[PDB]
């Protein structure tokens, strides 16, 4: 009852109040564009002739990804520094779509990424002899390796294991005293960096106290009066948010914060306003006339990519709210049906064409929007919850005598107080990373089971069946 | 017709280095003749760490083809430093770039690095540039973030005068007048009036409420104004009840009603509900949450249902 279909609701334009502006003009134009498409398309929930079918066109999307996977035109040079992202968007999408790569192709993926790895530490957006290490390519490369790699000598995981110390040193070189990280040498400082670093550090068991100092404060201070998070915060000789709450930066902030909550440091991490983050999150879901897709900023346009950035943050904000209420002492929190409808009806390329998913009608599909539309779709299809009982079960099976060599800190006392506290940290970080479960019977597949894609994990954004063997390898919990 | 760098005397002594992709890489890009050749020589230059005019020129060549090439931007800045180039000239060069590359992280960070280094006694000219920059794209995220850093950084150096703050608020007021739905401008107002260290926190609060309420009455369905109102009251721990009479009609300055203003306004209902919660009237608050969930904002049926149960 609490997730009404767009077709069951009244579609009306955002009221003008008799005061027109540039914003409203754009909004009205986008509303018409999305509405017409919904009007031309058959309601996915119904049991009509001439209407366009809204079924997920998985084979078209597979071909779209295949067409760009082995060769890209010269125009893509604008993404030359983001080729690890091109890998991630593709291999993650294929995972979601349930399409397996053969071992030969996976090996090619591994080979490509390993050439992006600098001996100095970290992955770049291209070969090490061409580009310097960067936090974002490092996230994208690591996740891609989790998806396409394995524990054989040509599986790449071995290479990551050996690179743990150097990757750590790269992270420490990026670290700023205020709690932020530069994305690369002399690079910019925002929560994208924090998020990517924390994911990798968590997955590879290279988290230390010196790495995390002030990281929580920098993130907390990014939360704006709206409830969401800006890109960064400024430390006045108090900390102040430097811009609007944004879907992308809200995702990175919520995820970063959540990753920090499983680190057993004292008075760590500094709290955020969970309820406000949840409110902002759910307020970004568009009205029926705009298909129920998410927007990334207040008074901006809905974009299929925020299905992941905003939608994917929903279960995280939700868990933080739950804990916050239990700290003092169920229906869905966003419209899971409408979001799926936006994806099926509006975000898919028109049928019988190039395939792929897009930002909005009128926008070309691309790898980035394909990956993020599908990731968001997954979150809406599957009720993902972080389970304390699952975390407990994980604690009980954890073997602290097994594990890779501890990273050596840059500062003598920058490491854990002692082996006991280190192993306790290892257990907590590992147990919580594997705490996300799919609630049985919580599945909602709009349009029928043929539309079902696989289940991505909140925070990490890789399939659970990829996450577990991967993190278990680096923690030696296989 | 493109002249290969291998045929150029200025580069004769340099041995180009090929991209090390490895065997049969995935997602390979078919680089144009120009781009590949430029990177072949950039690899050689960077590997030997040459800091010269020709290397500097080469970096400009490369970033024009790929404004997101962070490796080359990093190298370029180190070239500007080592060669002791005019940073003011470089900044002027960035004025051409910023035009067509408004959403390049690298261009904006480069500009930040330049102004941090130049460190002018009065950044008024840069501030005015940024203002003019926002005219063709008033919601450019990078630009707003940059404007924040600019005022923040130079204020810590005590280089922002009271007249300067005043003119900035004037400018922000004009931005919101042109488009009251520009959430970016609202964000800037919040920094100018609330979050910045030098914000006036007195009567001042009363003036702000007047502005906010008038904004709401101008555009009752403006989500930006509502978020600002709620954030404001929450930040300064101010009760909602006393202001309620100004919002009640949508379910201190009062409403009119403007044409095309369907009732009720969802966010007005949220205000009324939170008002009841403030009055310890949990059942009345639950009833309005239920209405939001069932009739007036059904897209968020689940969330409002959540808020309803939070009362019981």
């Amino acid at each position: 009852e609490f997730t009404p279909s767009v077709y069951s609701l009244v579609s009306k334009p955002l009221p003008s109040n008799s005061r027109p502006s540039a914003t409203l003009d754009e909004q009205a134009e986008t509303e018409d564009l999305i509405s017409q498409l919904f009007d031309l398309t058959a309601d996915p929930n119904a049991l009509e002739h001439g209407k366009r079918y809204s079924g997920l066109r998985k084979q078209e999307h597979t071909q779209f990804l295949a067409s760009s996977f082995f060769q890209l035109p010269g125009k893509f040079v604008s993404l030359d520094a983001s080729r690890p992202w091109l890998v991630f968007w593709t291999v993650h999408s294929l995972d979601l779509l349930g399409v397996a790569l053969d071992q030969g192709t996976k090996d090619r993926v591994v080979s490509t990424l390993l050439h992006f790895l600098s001996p100095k530490g970290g992955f770049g957006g291209g070969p090490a002899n061409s580009q310097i290490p960067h936090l974002l390519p490092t996230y994208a490369s690591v996740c891609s390796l989790a998806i396409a790699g394995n524990d054989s000598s040509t599986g790449g995981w071995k290479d990551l294991a050996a690179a743990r110390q150097s990757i750590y040193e790269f992270f420490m070189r990026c670290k700023r005293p205020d709690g932020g990280f530069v994305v690369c040498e002399g690079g910019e400082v925002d929560v994208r960096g924090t998020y990517c670093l924390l994911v990798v550090a968590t997955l590879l068991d290279i988290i230390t106290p010196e790495l995390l100092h002030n990281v929580d404060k920098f993130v907390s201070a990014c939360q704006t009066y709206e409830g969401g998070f800006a890109c960064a915060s400024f430390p006045f000789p108090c900390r102040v948010s430097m811009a609007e709450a944004h879907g992308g930066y809200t995702s990175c902030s919520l995820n970063s914060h959540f990753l920090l909550t499983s680190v057993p440091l004292p008075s760590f991490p500094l709290s955020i306003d969970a309820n406000a983050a949840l409110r902002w999150t759910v307020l970004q879901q568009g009205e029926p006339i705009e298909g129920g897709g998410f927007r990334g900023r207040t008074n901006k346009l809905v974009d299929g990519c925020y299905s992941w950035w905003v939608g994917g943050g929903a279960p995280v904000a939700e868990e933080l709210v739950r804990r916050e209420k239990s700290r003092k002492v169920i229906p869905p929190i966003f419209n899971r049906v409408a979001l799926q409808e936006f994806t099926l009806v509006a975000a898919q390329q028109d049928p019988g064409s190039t395939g792929g998913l897009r930002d909005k009608p009128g926008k070309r599909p691309d790898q980035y929007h394909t990956c993020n539309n599908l990731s968001g779709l997954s979150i809406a299809q599957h009720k993902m919850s972080h389970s304390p009982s699952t975390v407990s079960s994980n604690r009980l099976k954890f073997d602290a005598s097994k594990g890779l060599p501890a990273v050596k800190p840059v500062a003598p006392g920058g490491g854990w107080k002692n082996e006991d506290e280190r192993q306790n940290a290892r257990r907590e970080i590992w147990a919580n990373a594997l705490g996300w479960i799919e609630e049985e019977g919580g599945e909602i597949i709009v349009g029928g089971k043929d539309n079902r894609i696989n289940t991505t994990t909140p925070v990490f954004n890789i399939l659970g069946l990829r996450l577990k063997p991967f993190i278990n390898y680096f923690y030696c919990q296989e | 017709t493109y002249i290969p760098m291998s045929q150029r005397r200025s580069w004769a002594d340099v041995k180009p280095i090929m991209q090390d992709d490895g065997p049969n890489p995935v997602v390979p890009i078919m680089y144009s003749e120009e781009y590949k050749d430029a990177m072949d020589y950039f690899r050689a230059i960077a590997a030997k760490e040459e800091k010269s005019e020709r290397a500097l020129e080469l970096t400009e060549i490369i970033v024009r083809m790929n404004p997101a090439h962070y490796t080359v931007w990093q190298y370029r800045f180190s070239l500007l430093t080592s060669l002791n180039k005019s940073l003011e000239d470089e900044l002027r060069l960035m004025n051409e770039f910023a035009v067509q590359n408004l959403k390049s992280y690298q261009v904006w960070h480069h500009r930040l690095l330049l102004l941090d280094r130049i460190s002018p006694q009065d950044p008024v000219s840069e501030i005015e540039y940024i203002h003019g920059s926002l005219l063709p794209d008033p919601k450019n995220y990078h630009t707003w973030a940059y404007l924040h850093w600019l005022y923040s950084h130079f204020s810590t150096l005590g280089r922002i005068s009271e007249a300067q703050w005043g003119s900035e608020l004037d400018w922000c007021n004009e931005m919101l007048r042109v488009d009251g739905r520009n959430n970016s401008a609202w964000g800037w107002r919040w920094y100018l009036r609330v979050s910045r260290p030098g914000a006036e926190t007195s009567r001042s609060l009363q003036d702000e409420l007047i502005y906010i309420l008038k904004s709401i009455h101008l555009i009752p369905h403006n989500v930006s104004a509502w978020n600002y109102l709620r954030g404001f009251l929450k930040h300064f721990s101010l009760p909602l009840v006393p202001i309620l009479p100004a919002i009640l009609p949508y379910t201190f300055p009062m409403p009119s009603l403007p044409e095309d203003t369907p009732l009720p306004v969802p966010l007005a209902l949220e205000y009324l509900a939170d008002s009841f919660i403030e009055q310890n009237r949990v059942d009345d608050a639950a009833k309005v949450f239920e209405k939001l969930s069932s009739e007036y904002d059904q897209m968020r049926a689940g969330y409002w249902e959540f808020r309803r149960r939070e009362c019981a």
């Binding site: 520094a81 983001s82 992202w85 957006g125 960067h134 974002l136 390519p137 994305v183 994208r192 992308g248 974009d303 990519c305 897009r358 930002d359 009128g362 926008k363 070309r364 691309d366 980035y368 929007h369 | 997101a68 962070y70 959403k103 390049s104 992280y105």
Partner: peptide
């Protein structure tokens, strides 16, 4: 028909 401008890096 028009390319999307969603840059994350």
């Amino acid at each position: 028909p028009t390319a999307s401008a969603c840059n994350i890096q």
